Amino acid sequence: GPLGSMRLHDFVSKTVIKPESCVPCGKRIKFGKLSLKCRDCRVVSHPECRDRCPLPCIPT
Ligand SMILES: [Zn+2]
Ligand SMILES: [Zn+2]
């Protein structure tokens, strides 16, 4: 089977300043903690929950 690809997120490191909820695990990302936020969509997550973020990335 040949190689097809899926749109991945473009994660940038952002410090949590507002109330945030991790998309994969549903839990809150606490103040001052590092979070991964997609440049293209609304997806935000814990650094450790990164691989479980819903695919493909659909820019918002
Ligand atoms: Zn995305
Ligand atoms: Zn999480």
**CATH number assigned to the domain comprising residue 28:** 3.30.60.20
Ligand with minimal distance to 52 CA:
2
Q: How many CB atoms lie within 10 A of CB 60?
A: 8
Structure tokens at 27: 């839990």
Cβ-in-10-Å burial (0-12, 13-18, 19+) of 6 comes to exposed
Q: Are 21 and 15 in contact (CB under 8 A)?
A: no
Which range of residues forms the domain containing residue 10? Answer: 1-60
Which structural technique was applied? X-ray
Q: Is 57 helix (H, G, I), strand (E, B) or coil?
A: coil
Q: Are 24 and 49 in contact (CB under 8 A)?
A: yes
Q: Is 36 helix (H, G, I), strand (E, B) or coil?
A: strand
Q: Is 40 helix (H, G, I), strand (E, B) or coil?
A: coil
Ligand with minimal distance to 57 CA:
1
DSSP 15: E
CA of 2 to the centre of ligand 2 (A): 33
- In the chain, the number of structural domains is 1
CA of 1 to the centre of ligand 1 (A): 27
Q: Is 50 helix (H, G, I), strand (E, B) or coil?
A: helix
